[PDB]
């Protein structure tokens, strides 16, 4: 096994209690893209380095998502042949959902192959008039709860990373695409760098980072990392169980005030389990989960079952917000990976402190 150039400068990572499942999903009429074990292994191991280095940078130690390792530089990838041709699992109209329901049956019959509740599902590109090894597509490519979907094509190989070529440009688009789709699988919403992080570190991965990964600076936000800190496959505490039950948090006494360039957020919280952290999201309308690539995020540590929180936010960090209506969301993140939000709407032209 040879180590590609991009993987030569790498850090050691803590061992995790649970590992991200990797599935190479084949339609009954589909052959794999040749050499995929090596090619996707290198790409997933570099991605693991990226998440771990960003986690370490934000103070959480050398923690990334776990992977089941088969042998040196090779991930233990489940090769799955499906009951139906690939036409039955397209990008549009529930292709992903159908592919997932079949894997749920696979993992219920083969429980030793399931290493966590998070799965990344990879399908070879279609080859027709619209798509092919030159312009991949046709297959699921998104987050779906704790399942996410990416694709494979012959030149999907890390040796093209950063290269000013068609393969390099193609790789950044579909590698960053995979990086962000996986992000969604790891409990992450869309977000946008602050103005100062945009200057220091570049592009948030869960914003437009799917177009920059491997070519210009790309990074994870403090809010993204606060969520990864409560993600099952980042855990180094085996006694902590994840995602069971419902998120139970009472939030009280909220106040959001505007004194100058500062936004002041404060309040109370109570929950039967530890609340690890608070993420704050600020965006323009419209607000739906796929209209929020503009949500500028902030994060603060909490760490108690019951307590108080208080944050100051600089209005000048709100890079890209241009609308008179804006919404502030407060996401409370629990020790077991569940979270819940409260939203609050404001108008710069009629700006009123929130006080309940």
């Amino acid at each position: 096994v040879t180590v590609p150039d991009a993987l030569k400068d790498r850090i050691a990572l803590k061992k995790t209690a649970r590992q991200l499942n990797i599935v190479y999903f084949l339609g009954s009429d589909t052959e794999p893209v040749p050499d995929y074990e090596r090619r996707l292994s290198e790409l997933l191991l570099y991605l693991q380095q990226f998440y771990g280095k960003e986690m370490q940078r934000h103070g959480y130690g050398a923690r990334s998502f776990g992977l089941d390792i088969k042998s040196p530089g090779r991930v233990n990838i489940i090769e799955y042949k499906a009951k139906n041709p690939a036409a039955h699992y397209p990008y549009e109209n529930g292709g992903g959902w159908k592919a997932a329901q079949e894997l749920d049956e696979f993992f219920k019959a083969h429980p030793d192959r399931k290493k966590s509740q998070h799965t990344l599902i990879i399908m070879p590109t279609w080859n027709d008039e619209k798509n092919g090894p030159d312009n991949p597509g046709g297959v699921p490519f998104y987050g779906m709860g704790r399942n996410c979907f990416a694709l494979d094509y012959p030149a999907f190989d890390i040796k093209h990373l950063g290269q000013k070529t068609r393969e390099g440009r193609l790789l950044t688009k579909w590698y960053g695409g995979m990086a962000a789709a996986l992000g969604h699988g790891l409990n992450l919403p869309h977000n946008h760098q602050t103005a100062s992080d945009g200057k220091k570190y570049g592009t948030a991965l869960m914003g437009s980072g799917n177009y920059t990964f491997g070519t210009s600076p790309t990074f994870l936000t403090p809010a993204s990392c606060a969520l990864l800190d409560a993600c099952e496959v980042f855990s180094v505490t085996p006694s902590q169980q994840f995602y069971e039950g419902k998120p139970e948090v009472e939030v009280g006494d909220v106040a959001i005030s505007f004194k100058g360039d500062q936004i002041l957020v404060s309040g109370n919280y109570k929950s039967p389990q530890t609340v690890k952290a608070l993420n704050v999201y600020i965006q323009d309308p419209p607000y739906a989960v796929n209209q929020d690539y503009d949500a500028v995020s902030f994060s603060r540590r909490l760490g108690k079952k019951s307590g108080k929180f208080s944050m100051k936010i600089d209005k000048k960090e709100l890079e890209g917000l241009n609308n008179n209506e804006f919404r502030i969301s407060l996401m409370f993140i629990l020790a077991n990976g569940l979270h819940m939000q409260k939203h609050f709407t404001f108008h710069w032209d009629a700006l009123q402190d929130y006080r309940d």
Binding site: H190, V289, Y293
Partner: peptide, 10 residues
């Protein structure tokens, strides 16, 4: 509560 899938940036 409904949970929509998260697609990438146009």
């Amino acid at each position: 509560r409904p949970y929509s899938p998260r697609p990438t940036s146009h």
